[PDB]
Amino acid sequence: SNTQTVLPFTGLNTPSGVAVDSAGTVYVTDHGNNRVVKLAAGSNTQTVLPFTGLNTPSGVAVDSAGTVYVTDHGNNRVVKLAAGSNTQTVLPFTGLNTPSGVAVDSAGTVYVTDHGNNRVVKLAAGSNTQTVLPFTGLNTPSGVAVDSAGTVYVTDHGNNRVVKLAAGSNTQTVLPFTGLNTPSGVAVDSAGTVYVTDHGNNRVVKLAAGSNTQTVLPFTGLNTPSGVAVDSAGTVYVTDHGNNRVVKLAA
Template sequence: MSNAQAATTGGEDSAPPISTVAGTGVAGFKGDNDPAVAAQLNRPYGIAVDSTGTLYFSDHSNHRVRKITTDGKISTVAGIGSAGYRGDNGPALSAQLNGPREVAVDSAGAVYITDAGNHRIRKITADGTISTVAGTGTAGFSGDGGLATAARLNLPLGVAVDSTGVLYIAEYNNHRVRKITADGTISTVAGNGTAGSKGDGGPAASAQLNRPFAVAVDGAGDFYIADAHNHRVRKVVADGTISTVAGTGTAGFSGDDGPAASAQLNLPLGVVVDSAGTLYIADHANHRVRKVTADGTISTVAGTGTAGFGGDDGPAASAQLNKPLGLAVDCVDTLYVADYDNHRIRKIASAKLAGLPDSGTVVSWANVRSRLRMAVLRESTKDGAEVHQALATPRAHQRWRLVVAGQDNGDVLYRIENVRSGKVLEVVGAQELHGAVVAQRAYEGGDAHHQQWRLIPVGSVTGTPRVYEIANRNSGLLLRVDTNARTAIQQHGAEGDHRERQWQLLPV
């Protein structure tokens, strides 16, 4: 049984819960290098999640971009806190931004920012250096067919990046979406520059948009536009044809559980698409997040329609939002919402995590048979240090952070990260043999299948403590011990005493 199937049999409430991951609700700036839930934000706007699970967001009125790592800590990655323009080709932390809006992250970990008040798109590379990739700083429209750095933009608000590194920019005052290819060339891909709503069924570059606010790209390379003042979401497919996928063009709220194209939206300002092709919309003035499934049906996933704050740890559809803006999804389709006027970042748990630990959960693993704990030998922080079972102690070498690492055939994958060393659990040498030992090593990324694990629930997922089998993605074998002695943990099949391959998850 897969972990997805096992979770489904648990009978837990299927409504995904909502929670706060950053912000106290009080506008301000404080809290860097501490837990994000205790930090102050000031109108968070755009959000993006990278391949490691790090969340980036634009702290709009603080003129900063900040990040939240998988341990829940917040820090600033760009901006000094005062509006302006300076700092290109130097450290992003010393640079000035002017009302940053959306953010995006590419496959190499570079962060892109719509520096709206500066009419520029800026980029932060992995070493922390900031530069301009589009815009001269003068508002206007020019430069198509040439280098993006020599082009004029006019209040760029939305940005997205596809799997090939192509950037898409929603230009609010130019009523256009433009793209920047890998060689730095800019061109218009949607909108003729005149505000309006015409053009569905024809070429997107000849169509009218009205204050596009955001853009998102799906796995097929199609892109979606939050056509804000048309109260619509529109889609551009690979051949350049544009159509409306949600909204009638009249502001309001209606249509849930029916065709999205017949529903009313009220200032759709954010869009994102998950791994299944489900479209999520920040229905800003309706104080809701709505979704459109592959069959075109729309429904509300978060928000009651009344502005406010409430509902954390309960069903998202019963919670209050206050002018939601940016949206993002992670590798298992957890949805993140910039709850703009609540000065918070909130998340809606993925249905795929039903019966499984939330990403970032810190636990101690106890073998069901031996009652001993999973621990790094001699508390080592070195690559290759073996992982053994040991007597319980309240020390960090026995604590493990569970971070979602992706999906495989519908199953959630985790990397199991030692709290003391920051290194992850792996099968030594990526072996597929029974009896291979496990150790810790620096995470090698999404292709490192020997460092990724399935958690298979055993028994009721409502039991305390929960019990799991831990299966390696690469070998398919299970972590097991066959003795009560303090010895190395190995991978084996499902033979023998079932307790030897079962592990209690003990939150710490």
Template sequence: MTTLAGGREAGYLEGIASAAAFNQPNDLAFDASGNLLVADQKNHAIRSISPDGTVRTLAGGESGYGEGQGKAAKFDTPQGIAVDTAGNAYVADTWNQRIRKIRPDGLVSTLAGNGASGYQDGAGVAAKFNHPQGVAVDGAGNVYVADSWNQRIRKISPGGLVSTLAGTGESGFLDGREARFNGPVGLAVSKEGIVYVGDTWNHRVRKITPDGRVSTLAGNGSYGFKDGKAEAAWFKSADKLAIDARGDLYVSDPLNQRIRKVSIGSTP
């Protein structure tokens, strides 16, 4: 294991990866060119690490809300990022209560959310979120949002319509069509359109079919650490997720100081 970029001290520096500085980098996503995009939450910026190890700021760098080109845009504690096949990046701009879009040319706009915390489905900027913390995008261009304080998983269509995929809005644990979550944070989408959710304070990884049916993929709800069969595993904090080309799922479990792997092919 090696350090790709950044050092011991929090800060904000661009340039050679080993000399660059970040401030609580939270989520990661690769673009088609092999650049690693970073949601650098306390720098209120989206950073890019090129394949040759150069760190630059793709967008933002100052707390607030503003659209525009590159560094002229403003974010407030971005915590989630995902990239689509066309190279657009989607950002969970958590404290702005919005989902932002960064085009490949660096232009930042608002995809959904009107900036007021709350819950409302509907067209794009008329919708409301409550601390969105994770995003994922499928092959059809649908963007999924872990709307953490609303205890819901939201879906934004390519046309910009926001709907609720799963969750009643009540915190708790329940599978099925009336599912309940407790602090959903991380998301990943399979090639088949299955949405996986890091259901942090339920200590579980949940699974949502395209028609909105929720089940539990891994974790039995116990707080702690235990590997083994997915349904018997223990997590402390199932958080951000990533999925590989084979469909296996990786789970950050920060309170256990571990990265966990769920082998999807071996799970019922």
């Protein structure tokens, strides 16, 4: 599609992260209101998720079981809520410093951009010992995403670049995105196409696997967008942070 629609959220204040689950339910970190809201596909009535004590939340992710993970950036923690539960769990990360993006892979491993420590960390499901991902040279990184192959993508915000690391690899590759200006969110679809919110240029760009020529998505009227997500149908969701709204592009 070349024409976006505005999602029927209400009351958002500078939304940040966005995630979409297998059923098309959309999750948004309503950053300015210290809450996370969700909107089922076909719904015009949002629900506020029963997280407790959030402060300035940023990243959000959802796994195949519908567990929702939130970076509680103001409280230096990552919390999760299982589908149907009203009792959150704080993940046993160590030494987090102003974390930003969060992603979850098909094994349940949780990846967090530890923004103030210039690093990305991960916690296996049921593990209490995190590991650091062997990225080099990160500078105030923000978004993180992980594909079904285990490849991890990070927006190296301070360096105006996007970096990736294959599973088990110790050698990162810098993606051939061009013209970036303070990149923010990142997402990856089932085909390996990487989507990046080009925050300072009010646009969203993508790079197909195997390609080194990017495409700009036909969003319009964005102001300082932040989070991005893509569902299994190819629909792309962007938190239009500056306009307190979430927009989507079908196809």
